[PDB]
Design a protein around this ligand. Structure first.
Ligand code: MG
Ligand code: MG
Ligand code: MG
Ligand code: MG
Ligand code: MG
Ligand code: MG
Ligand code: MG
Ligand code: MG
Ligand code: MG
Ligand code: MG
Ligand code: MG
Ligand code: MG
Ligand code: MG
Ligand code: MG
Ligand code: MG
Ligand code: MG
Lengths: 107, 153, 63, 402
RNA sequence: GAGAUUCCCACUGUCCCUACCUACUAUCCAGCGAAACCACAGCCAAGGGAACGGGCUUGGCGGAAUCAGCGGGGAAAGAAG
RNA sequence: CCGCAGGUGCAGAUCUUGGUGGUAGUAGCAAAUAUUCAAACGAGAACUUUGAAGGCCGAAGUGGAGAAGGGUUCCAUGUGAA
C-alpha cells in the first residue's frame, strides 16, 4: 500500500551525539526529517508543530534522547506538484520507551 | 543580430541569446564548456543535476583555488563545482531556444548544442570600504551568452 | 499577506505592546482588509484580534 | 655561526616519505633467506588485530631482579583464521631483479577471494576466473598447466603461494578477502612446487606456519592521525607563550644559504597511516579457537595450566571496537601497529635468534579477561554473578519463569 | 605610588614536557567578491662577473593541471634612507 | 609636385588622462549565546508576514520620550531596473 501509517521510535541521542550546544535541536529536526525520508521514501516531509515543540521542549541543547513519532504517508494529490506523496510526522507522547517496537497503525 | 559562428544550415538550427546577465562570467564559461556538444535533453538533465549537486562542471581554465571533488573524475579533471546560478541561467536560455525551435517547427528531440559562447559584459561598479579610509571597487562580472542548437540524430 | 500595519494599529488600540497582539492566522485576508482603527476595533469585537495575557511571573516562591 | 648548544635531531630521516601508505595490507618487502637444507615451509601469515590485554607469568632469566618472579606483561591478540591457498607464483632471477615467470591459479577459487578482484561486487556479473577454471578440466588446458608447472620447476628460483584470508569467520563488516604472496622456503624448487601443489585449494592454519615462543616480525600500517603540525608530527619544542604568529611551529626552517628549504627540516603534514615493520615480537600463545565436538569449547583460549578456568580470550563484554574472537589467535608480546581490526602481516624473523631474550620458554599463569569497555573488575560472567548475587532484573525474569 | 630594583612565603603549564576539550575561524560548498604587487620570469652546484645569478659558461638535469600548509629565497612589498 | 610656416615624429620622465589584465572566482563576507516548525502571499522564501516554540536585552535596557544635528528620512499605496 501507499497510504500507510506507522509508529516508530527515534534515537535522537544517537543521531545528535557530538553536535554542539547551539545546534542540537535544529540538527534533531534535520535528523527527524532525514529519518522520515529514509523510512517512507518521500522527499516531501512535513513535521507537526506539536512534534517541533516536543523536540524543543527542553531547550536548544538538552534534546530528549528518544522520541516516539508517527509517520503517515498521505496523498499530495491536491495540486500540480512534482511529488504525489508526502509524509506527515506527528508526536506520540509515551511514558516509557521500553519494549516499544515499530508498529503498523490502522486508520 | 550578428552571432559568431553562423550555422552551416539556418533551417535545421535555432538561436538563443542573452545580454548583461547577472551571473559570474568564469562560472558560466565553465558550465557552457561542460554542456557544449550535448544533446538538449542530456544538457537539461545535466544542468538540473548540477543544481542538485549530483553532477559537477569541471573548472579547467578558471580553476584558481577551486576545490577537488569526486564527481570531477567523470571528466578528465580533478577540480569541479556546482554553479547553481549559471546552471539556472543556462536552463532558461535552453528553454527559450527550445521555444524558438518550436516556432521554427523543427522537433526538439534531436537538437544538439553545437555553438555556445560566453562573453564578458560591461562591468557594474559597487563600492567597498577598507582599513585606513580607503575605497576599493566591488565590480560585478556579467556575461553575454549565445547559443546555436542544431538538429541531428 | 503582510500585517505589520494591522499589528501596529491593534497594539495602539488595545493599549498593549505588539507582544500581546494576537492576529488570527486563519483569517489573514479579513485582517489584511483592515486599514483603519475603526476596522481594527471591529475585528477586536469580532474576536479575530485578541490581547494575549501577561506572561506569568509568580511570587509564590518568594512568599 | 654554529648553534650555541648541541642537541640531537628531532625525528628520523630513515622514514622521510612521511606520507599515507599506498597500501592497506602491509607488504613483506623481504622474505627470509632460503636454504634448501631446511624442510619446506611458509614464511608468513595474515592476521587481524583484535585487541590488547595483559598476562601474568614467571620469568626464567638468571641473574635478573625478576628471576623466578611474577611479572605482568601487555600482550596483543591477533585473530588468525586459516589461510586458503589458491595459487602459485614462480619467480626467475635476472640481472634486473626477480621477475614473475608464471602464475597458476587453482580451481574453485572461493567467493570471498573472488571479491578481491572487483571494486563493485554488487554490480558485477561474478565472471572472474570463470574461463580460467575451465582449463583444469579439458585435456588441452591440463597439458598447458602441466607445461607451466614443469617450466616453473626447471626455470624458477623462488616460488610463492597466493593465499587469502577467510572473511566469513571474522566479526568484521568487510567480506572482501585479503590476498597475499607468501614465500615457500626450505627445499629444492621441485620439492616446494610439489608441496604447494598439494596445498592448492587447502587451508593452512597458523600453527603450521608459526610456533610457540618464537620471535617474529609484524608488518602493517599504523593508525592514521590526519594532517598534523610539527609539534605533534616531529615532536619539536613548543615555542614560548609570547610568540606572536604561533607557538606550535619550527622557528627557523633554514639558513639564508643554501637559499632553499632542506628536506631535513620538520614540516607539517600527514601523520600516521605509515607502513612499518617491527621485528622481534615474541609469540606468547597460539590459541586453538572454538570447537564443537559435543559442546562448545572455549577453555582452550584463555585457560592456563594454573588457572583451569573455562573462559575464552574474549574480554567480558567482548573486544572493544572489534567483536568476538572465535578462530585461532596469536598472543604476541607488547604493542602492534595499526588500529583494531587492522590486517597485519606476520613474518618469520630474518635474523638468527641466539640471545637469551629469544629462545626463552614462555609459560603463562594467568590471562586477564576483565572488561576493557571501562574499568572491568570481573574475569567471568559466573564470577560476577557469584559476587553480586541475584539482581532485580533476574528477580523479575524468574517471577515470569516461575 | 598602574614609578625602578632584590629577596622570601604561598601559588601555579613559565618550564621539565607536553596532552586533551570547547567556541569562532581556517577548510569544502551556494551566493557575492577586492587589494598590494607585476622588465620578462621563476629547479640547482661551481665559475667568472659591479668582488653573493633565475637568465651567461661548464656541469647536475628537466613531464600537464592542481589542493591544503609553510615561511629558506625572490639581496620580497611598503617610503626618492 | 614647387615654395612658405610650425604647438611637427616617443618606450621610458615613481610622466598626465583614460582604459584593461595577471593576481583571482582568490583574500574575504568570523566582536556583542540562537534559532526551529507550520501556513499565507508569491513565478520564486534560510531572510517577508501570521501563528506556535526556544532564547536574548533584563528598568544604568536592545524599553518609552526629548536637546543638538538631519530635512521629509514620517504615513499609505505600488514597483522589483539600480
Ligand atoms: Mg591560489
Ligand atoms: Mg571593510
Ligand atoms: Mg573612515
Ligand atoms: Mg659543536
Ligand atoms: Mg608580541
Ligand atoms: Mg578500556
Ligand atoms: Mg646558484
Ligand atoms: Mg635619496
Ligand atoms: Mg628623503
Ligand atoms: Mg610638441
Ligand atoms: Mg606611450
Ligand atoms: Mg574563500
Ligand atoms: Mg569568514
Ligand atoms: Mg536574561
Ligand atoms: Mg532610550
Ligand atoms: Mg517608513
Amino acid at each position: 500500500n501507499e497510504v500507510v501509517t506507522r509508529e516508530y521510535t527515534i534515537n535522537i541521542h544517537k543521531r545528535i551525539h557530538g553536535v554542539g550546544f547551539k545546534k542540537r535541536a535544529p540538527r534533531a529536526l534535520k535528523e527527524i526529517r532525514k529519518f522520515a525520508m529514509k523510512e517512507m521514501g518521500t522527499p516531501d516531509v512535513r513535521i507537526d508543530t506539536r512534534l517541533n515543540k516536543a523536540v524543543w521542549a527542553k531547550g536548544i541543547r538538552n534534546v530528549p534522547y528518544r522520541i516516539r513519532v508517527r509517520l503517515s504517508r498521505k496523498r499530495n494529490e491536491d495540486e500540480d506538484s512534482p511529488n504525489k506523496l508526502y509524509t506527515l510526522v506527528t508526536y506520540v507522547p509515551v511514558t516509557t520507551f521500553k519494549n516499544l517496537q515499530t508498529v503498523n497503525v490502522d486508520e | 543580430v550578428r552571432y559568431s559562428l553562423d550555422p552551416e544550415n539556418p533551417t535545421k538550427s535555432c538561436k538563443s541569446r542573452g545580454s548583461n546577465l547577472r551571473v559570474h562570467f568564469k562560472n558560466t564559461r565553465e558550465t557552457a564548456q561542460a554542456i557544449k556538444g550535448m544533446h538538449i535533453r542530456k544538457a537539461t538533465k545535466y544542468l538540473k543535476d548540477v543544481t542538485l549537486q549530483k553532477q559537477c562542471v569541471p573548472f579547467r581554465r578558471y580553476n584558481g583555488g577551486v576545490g577537488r571533488c569526486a564527481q570531477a573524475k567523470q571528466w578528465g579533471w580533478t577540480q569541479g563545482r556546482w554553479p547553481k546560478k549559471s546552471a539556472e541561467f543556462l536552463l532558461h536560455m535552453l528553454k527559450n531556444a527550445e521555444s524558438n525551435a518550436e516556432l521554427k517547427g523543427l522537433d526538439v528531440d534531436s537538437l544538439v548544442i553545437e555553438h555556445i559562447q560566453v562573453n564578458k559584459a560591461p562591468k557594474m561598479r559597487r563600492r567597498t570600504y577598507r582599513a585606513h579610509g580607503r575605497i576599493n571597487p566591488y565590480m560585478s562580472s556579467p556575461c553575454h551568452i549565445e547559443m546555436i542548437l542544431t538538429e541531428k540524430e | 499577506s503582510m500585517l505589520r500595519l494591522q499589528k501596529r494599529l491593534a497594539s495602539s488600540v488595545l493599549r498593549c505592546g505588539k507582544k500581546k497582539v494576537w492576529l488570527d492566522p486563519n483569517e489573514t485576508n479579513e485582517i489584511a482588509n483592515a486599514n483603519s482603527r475603526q476596522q481594527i476595533r471591529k475585528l477586536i469585537k469580532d474576536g479575530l484580534i485578541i490581547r494575549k495575557p501577561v506572561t506569568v511571573h509568580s511570587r509564590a516562591r518568594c512568599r | 655561526s654554529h648553534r650555541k648548544f648541541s642537541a640531537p635531531r628531532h625525528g628520523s630521516l630513515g622514514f622521510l616519505p612521511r606520507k599515507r601508505s599506498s597500501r592497506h595490507r602491509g607488504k613483506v618487502k623481504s622474505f627470509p633467506k632460503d636454504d634448501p637444507s631446511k624442510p619446506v615451509h611458509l614464511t608468513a601469515f595474515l592476521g587481524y588485530k583484535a585487541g590488547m590485554t595483559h598476562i601474568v607469568r614467571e620469568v626464567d632469566r638468571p641473574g635478573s631482579k625478576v628471576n623466578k618472579k611474577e611479572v605482568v606483561e601487555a600482550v596483543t591478540i591477533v585473530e588468525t583464521p586459516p589461510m586458503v591457498v589458491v595459487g602459485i607464483v614462480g619467480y626467475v632471477e635476472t640481472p634486473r631483479g626477480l621477475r614473475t615467470f608464471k602464475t597458476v591459479f587453482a580451481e574453485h577459487i572461493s567467493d570471498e577471494c573472488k571479491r578481491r578482484f572487483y571494486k563493485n561486487w554488487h554490480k558485477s556479473k561474478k565472471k572472474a576466473f570463470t574461463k580460467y577454471c575451465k582449463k583444469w578440466q579439458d585435456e588441452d588446458g591440463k597439458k598447458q598447466l602441466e607445461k607451466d608447472f614443469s617450466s616453473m620447476k626447471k626455470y624458477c628460483q623462488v616460488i610463492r603461494v597466493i593465499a587469502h584470508t577467510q572473511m566469513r569467520l571474522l566479526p568484521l563488516r568487510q567480506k572482501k578477502a585479503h590476498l597475499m604472496e607468501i614465500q615457500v622456503n626450505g627445499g629444492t624448487v621441485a620439492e616446494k612446487l610439489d608441496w604447494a601443489r598439494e596445498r592448492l585449494e587447502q587451508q593452512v592454519p597458523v600453527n603450521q606456519v608459526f610456533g610457540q615462543d618464537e620471535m617474529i616480525d609484524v608488518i602493517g600500517v599504523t593508525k592514521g592521525k590526519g594532517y598534523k603540525g610539527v609539534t605533534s608530527r616531529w615532536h619539536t619544542k613548543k615555542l614560548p607563550r609570547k610568540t606572536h604568529r604561533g607557538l606550535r611551529k619550527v622557528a627557523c626552517i633554514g639558513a639564508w644559504h643554501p637559499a632553499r628549504v632542506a628536506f631535513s627540516v620538520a614540516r607539517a603534514g600527514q601523520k600516521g597511516y605509515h607502513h612499518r615493520t617491527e621485528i622481534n615480537k615474541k609469540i606468547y600463545k597460539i590459541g586453538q579457537g572454538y570447537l564443537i565436538k559435543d559442546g562448545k569449547l572455549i577453555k582452550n583460549n584463555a585457560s592456563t595450566d594454573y588457572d583451569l578456568s573455562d573462559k575464552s580470550i574474549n574480554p567480558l563484554g567482548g573486544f572493544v571496537h572489534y567483536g568476538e574472537v572465535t578462530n585461532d589467535f596469536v598472543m604476541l608480546k607488547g604493542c602492534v601497529v595499526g588500529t583494531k581490526k587492522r590486517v597485519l602481516t606476520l613474518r618469520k624473523s630474518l635474523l638468527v635468534q641466539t640471545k637469551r631474550r629469544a629462545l626463552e620458554k614462555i609459560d603463562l599463569k594467568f590471562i586477564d579477561t576483565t572488561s576493557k569497555f571501562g574499568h572491568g573488575r570481573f574475569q567471568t560472567m559466573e564470577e560476577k554473578k557469584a559476587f553480586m548475587g541475584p539482581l532485580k532484573k533476574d528477580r523479575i525474569a524468574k517471577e515470569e519463569g516461575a
